[PDB]
Symmetry: none
Subunit: 126 residues, 2 copies
């Protein structure tokens, strides 16, 4: 299991996490979710938010009383571990109508490469 | 003002008014004013009482002989006329010691966006 692959996803988490306050501020001020396909007040264009392994970081999502805004990092399509190429890592705002805002992490990459708090759970059924 | 601004404030009035019976029933049965920061018996959570233009409707206030319970509608922070964004419209219970419940309307919006019954009065001194 590649620890190099794990670190690449860690970069995506860090870059996505860097937008949490800016996105939460807009949600709390305006009750809306900012979208940065182009630069928008206070947030750079998604493709201008990048790293060594991350192509873009896109804010979006659908607003609900509980939150709903998303920050999605998309991995580069080369010079990245093959199972991560083009994959995404998503932070989603929640809890906004109950208590302190939360940011849940999910991803379409395999759990083996993800931080524990970003992994899905698989169970048997009856 | 515009028909749209009127419709927006009117939604607040309508949503707040939909809680009058429930609030007044609790004041009369329990003796205290219900608070719906969380859902409470008879009343939804404030943020679950919403509309096209209205973000939440909160019951509260301090009991007095004549009532005193409040129903406060908060306007959304977007998709509403700019001067109404985030403003509140308050209905306050009165006359409870005398007869039929009355509900006086106040607001923290500019008077020009409010119907006469909800407006403040300014005079020289």
């Amino acid at each position: 299991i590649s620890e190099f692959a794990r670190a690449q996803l860690s970069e995506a988490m860090t870059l996505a996490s860097g937008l949490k306050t800016k996105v939460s501020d807009i949600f709390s001020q305006d009750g809306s979710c900012p979208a940065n396909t182009a630069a928008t007040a206070g947030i750079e264009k998604d493709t201008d938010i990048n790293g060594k392994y991350v192509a873009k970081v896109t804010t979006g999502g659908t607003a609900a009383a509980s939150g709903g805004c998303t920050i999605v990092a998309t991995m580069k399509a080369s010079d990245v571990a093959t199972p991560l190429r083009g994959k995404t890592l998503t932070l989603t705002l929640g809890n906004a109508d109950k208590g302190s805002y939360t940011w849940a992490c999910t991803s379409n990459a395999d759990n083996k490469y993800l931080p524990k708090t970003c992994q899905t759970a698989t169970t048997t059924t009856p």
